[PDB]
Amino acid sequence: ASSFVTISGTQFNIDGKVGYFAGTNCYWCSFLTNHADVDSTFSHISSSGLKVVRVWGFNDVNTQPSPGQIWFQKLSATGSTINTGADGLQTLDYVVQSAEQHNLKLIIPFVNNWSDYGGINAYVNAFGGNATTWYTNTAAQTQYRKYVQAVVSRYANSTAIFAWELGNEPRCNGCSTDVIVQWATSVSQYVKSLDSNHLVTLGDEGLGLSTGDGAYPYTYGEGTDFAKNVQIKSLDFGTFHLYPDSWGTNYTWGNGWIQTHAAACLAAGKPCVFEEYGAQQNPCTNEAPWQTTSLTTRGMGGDMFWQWGDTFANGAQSNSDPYTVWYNSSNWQCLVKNHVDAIN
Ligand SMILES: OC[C@H]1O[C@@H](O[C@H]2[C@H](O)[C@H](O)[C@H](O)O[C@@H]2CO)[C@@H](O)[C@@H](O)[C@@H]1O
Ligand SMILES: *[C@@H]1O[C@H](CO)[C@@H](O)[C@H](O)[C@H]1NC(C)=O
Ligand SMILES: *[C@@H]1O[C@H](CO)[C@@H](O)[C@H](O)[C@H]1NC(C)=O
Ligand SMILES: *[C@@H]1O[C@H](CO)[C@@H](O)[C@H](O)[C@H]1NC(C)=O
Ligand SMILES: *[C@@H]1O[C@H](CO)[C@@H](O)[C@H](O)[C@H]1NC(C)=O
């Protein structure tokens, strides 16, 4: 069966089945130009038992790239352009076509907080201000909402969308936490006005929560208040990410991070998604306990490791980083096949 993804209780209902899910992050799937490479990668994710894939819904530039290169939007002070050609959103159309064929669902964010594939910084280059005034910059928000409409209107009636996501890891360094509350409230209401079929979520890391141990990720220096954000009526579930190597914490501290976020989602009456995580050293040893904590904590609806790695018919490998779990490797057995077997 194929239906729209909804919430039943504090769990997700995916194609009629209510219960915990495992998924993965594949940002780079959206920029593949050979259809055979999207089909082999999605065949491997589906046969491993994963049900949800997170892909980028953006690729922002200030100058058009070399001919043949993918770009979704060019941001300029004298008129921006949204690319719907073969080197533009037609690459994302194939990803949604392949998810429909393979019975997979997709989480799709509209902008990056960081400068990879343009981000907030590509809007600042075109419309001025800086990375914290971006949220209230009228020319930047007018173009961001025109790009949201261009992506949402393509797939609004497709059953392969798990959720729309306002951005990857939005932050407002040193800002009052109300700047992201008011922006996320207005933009999620706009997404719901374009599409009443699909769930909407923020895409934040989960920073700012007072029931923890006081380490930096629980404090309020990045402009976000997790409990305030998940109470917004037009956000349907909470997201949180986990990277002890970048945040100055040890790996076992991650279990309490999952438990505190789960409890804050369940207090707001909604599921949480453990949407990104990784350990640079010994990932099988250090990330397996996190997957067991998430599966056995009330308030959790599913988890998605960062990130899938795969290889193609011509012998090329995908994009990758030190957190890649390569399909069919010993870390795939440990963190993918053994975890799907424990879920069901
Ligand atoms: O959290 C993963 C993101 O980390 C970012 O770097 C942060 C780091 O998390 C921490 O908050 C430190 O205090 O500031 C760093 C730099 O601004 C980036 O590396 C980003 O790419 C990651 O996705
Ligand atoms: C960003 O611009 C705002 C408004 O002028 C300013 O108050 C803030 O200090 C600036 N950020 C940086 C890092 O300069
Ligand atoms: C598409 O979905 C919208 C709700 O977002 C609904 O109003 C519309 O009727 C659907 N289109 C078709 C052709 O069913
Ligand atoms: C690591 O951190 C926690 C506190 O955040 C501490 O209680 C624990 O003993 C430490 N564990 C290891 C294995 O270092
Ligand atoms: C994956 O490993 C199995 C052996 O367990 C093998 O049959 C299959 O060819 C492999 N897939 C790829 C893409 O190599």
CATH number, domain at 272? 3.20.20.80
> Which letter does DSSP use for residue 317 in this model?
B
**Alpha helix positions (H), the chain:** 35-47, 89-102, 119-127, 138-155, 178-194, 226-230, 244-247, 253-267, 283-295, 330-332, 338-343
Ligand 2 pocket mutation pick from 121, 124, 132, 137 by most atoms within 8 angstroms of CB? 132
Three-state DSSP class for residue 189: helix
Which residue's C-alpha comes closest to atom 5 of ligand 4?
253
Are 204 and 240 within 8 A, CB to CB?
yes
Answer whether 193 contacts ligand 3 (Cβ < 6 A). Answer: no
Query: How many structural domains are present in the chain?
Result: 1
Q: Which ligand is nearest to the CA of 214?
A: 4
Nearest alpha carbon to residue 301 among 342, 254, 261: 261
275 is in an annotated binding site: no
Three-state DSSP class for residue 144: helix
Tabulate helix, strand, coil % of the chain (nearest 5).
40, 20, 45
Answer whether 130 contacts ligand 2 (Cβ < 6 A). Answer: yes
Element (H, E) at 162: strand 161-165
Q: Which atom of ligand 3 is nearest the CA belonging to 198? A: 5
Q: 105: domain range? A: 1-344
145 is in an annotated binding site: no
Three-state DSSP class for residue 275: strand
Answer whether 252 contacts ligand 4 (Cβ < 6 A). Answer: yes
* Spacing, Cα 123 to ligand 2 middle (Å): 16
Answer whether 253 contacts ligand 4 (Cβ < 6 A). Answer: yes
C-alpha–C-alpha distance, residues 264 and 335, integer Å:
26
C-alpha–C-alpha distance, residues 332 and 53, integer Å:
16
170 is in an annotated binding site: yes
Only one residue has tokens 């669902």, namely 105
* Triad 329, 306, 256: Cα angle to 5°: 115
Q: What is the DSSP string of 92-143?
A: HHHHHHHHHHHT-EEEEES-BSSSTTSHHHHHHHHH-S-TTTGGG-HHHHHH
Resolution (A): 1.4
Are 302 and 52 within 8 A, CB to CB?
yes
Set 222, 275, 276, 287: catalytic member:
276
Answer whether 133 contacts ligand 2 (Cβ < 6 A). Answer: yes
C-alpha–C-alpha distance, residues 236 and 18, integer Å:
16
Within 13 Å, how many C-alpha atoms sit on residue 233's CB side?
A: 2
C-alpha–C-alpha distance, residues 290 and 252, integer Å:
8
Nearest alpha carbon to residue 227 among 207, 247, 244: 207
298 is in an annotated binding site: no
Answer whether 213 contacts ligand 4 (Cβ < 6 A). Answer: yes
What technique solved it? X-ray
